[PDB]
Design a protein around this ligand. Structure first.
Ligand SMILES: Nc1ncnc2[nH]cnc12
Length: 404
């Protein structure tokens, strides 16, 4: 009558296990006091790049816990999956050896149902599409017409993803690299998901794009009182404020350049960089913005304490940057200790204007349109990570006979 699912998320600095218990209607059942069992170990699979057998072994305590959580009679029919990030940055084919060692370990050490596609790297558009499933699952939209689903935007470190449901018309029309449409059937309803991952335009990566605009020169995107170097992907970028410090107007123009808003559009309409926007529409009217779209507001005191998401309009980011872009590093460090925790005080103005620009100029959102940003989303009384794991589990369970 019910089904479990076990999902590993092998991130860059640790590995996490999620176990879910779905009832007959695909609603999550509590496990203890949460809507999942969750645990984490460190370090991540990357720490064992040189020893793949040990990378897989790192996960064994988590697996054992998952084995104890799922009652033994269900084990045979319970899917287990592992999604890895990052891990691609590994030299030679250390990436693939690790994934294979994981497969071997799951096959040797567990009783769970390991499918051929169980262990993989979750790219870019795959992540965006799983996040779309997580969010629309949590909100009870699966099986509804595409127009009642909530599109997702995820500002990762390296990339930003946009995922939202479209018409079969729009899908069929889609331009002929990651394909722009991902077909997924959820609760028996086929969806055509517009999906795109923008490499270089994640939170960390975007700073490098921005600083490239000014080459060896000071940048007005940098706060007064920092004159340093930004390192991204082993490249150094000069990051020094001009004499007058940061400046919202000039930083914004630099950001507009960095985004390649003016890149010619080979299709009907584009976001930026010549990328097709997927045509917009009802599927993109309600949005949930994940990861750094939440972290930044949280770090500049926009979010109520003890909260994992918030409603905001993009104008809120612009208005925040208008103040923050007048401040220096000491001012911002004192105002916003979380930026100091994360070592990104100098980039406060840049980060805000970037998010405002990306949303409005880039993705064509109305600056007054409310969106939800969060790292977690409410499900019953609990919070679910606004990430790919749950969506991955949902998809896995939906392949079972019965769940349909
Ligand atoms: N508030 C935060 N800022 C930056 N990175 C994070 N990762 C998790 N929480 C974060």
């Amino acid at each position: 009558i019910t089904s479990y699912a076990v999902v590993f998320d092998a991130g860059s600095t640790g590995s996490r296990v999620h176990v879910y218990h779905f009832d007959q209607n695909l609603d999550l059942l509590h496990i203890g006091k949460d809507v999942e069992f969750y645990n984490k170990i460190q370090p991540g699979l990357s720490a064992y790049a040189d020893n793949p057998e040990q990378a897989a072994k790192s996960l064994i305590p988590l697996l054992e816990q998952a084995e104890n959580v799922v009652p033994e009679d269900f084990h045979s029919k319970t899917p287990i999956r592992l999604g890895a990030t990052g891990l691609r940055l590994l030299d030679g084919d250390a990436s693939e050896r690790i994934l294979q060692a994981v497969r071997d370990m799951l096959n040797n050490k567990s009783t769970f149902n390991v499918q051929p596609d169980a262990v993989s790297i979750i790219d870019g558009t795959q992540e965006g599409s799983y996040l779309w499933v997580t969010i629309n699952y949590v909100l009870g939209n699966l099986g509804k017409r595409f127009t009642n689903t909530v599109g997702v935007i995820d500002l990762g470190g390296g990339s930003v993803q946009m995922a939202y449901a479209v018409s079969k018309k729009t899908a069929r029309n889609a331009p002929k690299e990651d394909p722009y449409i991902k077909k997924i059937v959820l609760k028996g309803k086929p969806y055509d998901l517009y999906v795109h991952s923008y490499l270089h335009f994640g939170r960390e990566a975007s700073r490098a794009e921005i600083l490239k605009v000014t080459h060896g020169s000071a940048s007005p995107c940098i706060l007064a009182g920092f004159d340093g170097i930004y390192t991204y992907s082993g490249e150094e970028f000069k990051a020094s404020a001009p004499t007058s410090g940061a400046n919202f107007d000039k930083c914004k123009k630099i950001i507009q350049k960095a985004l390649k808003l003016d890149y010619p559009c080979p299709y009907q309409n584009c976001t930026f960089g010549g990328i097709w926007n997927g045509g917009g529409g009802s599927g993109q009217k309600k949005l949930f913005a994940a990861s750094s779209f939440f972290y930044l507001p949280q770090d500049v005191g926009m979010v109520d304490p003890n909260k994992s998401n918030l409603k905001l309009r993009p104008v809120d980011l612009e208005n925040k940057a208008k103040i923050v872009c007048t401040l220096n590093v000491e001012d911002v460090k004192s105002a916003y200790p979380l930026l100091e925790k994360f070592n990104i005080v100098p980039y406060a103005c840049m980060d805000l204007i970037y998010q405002y620009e990306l949303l409005v100029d880039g993705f064509g959102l109305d600056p007054l349109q409310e969106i939800t940003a969060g790292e977690k989303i409410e499900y019953q009384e609990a919070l679910v990570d606004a990430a790919w794991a749950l969506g991955n589990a949902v998809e896995a369970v939906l392949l079972l006979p019965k769940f349909e």
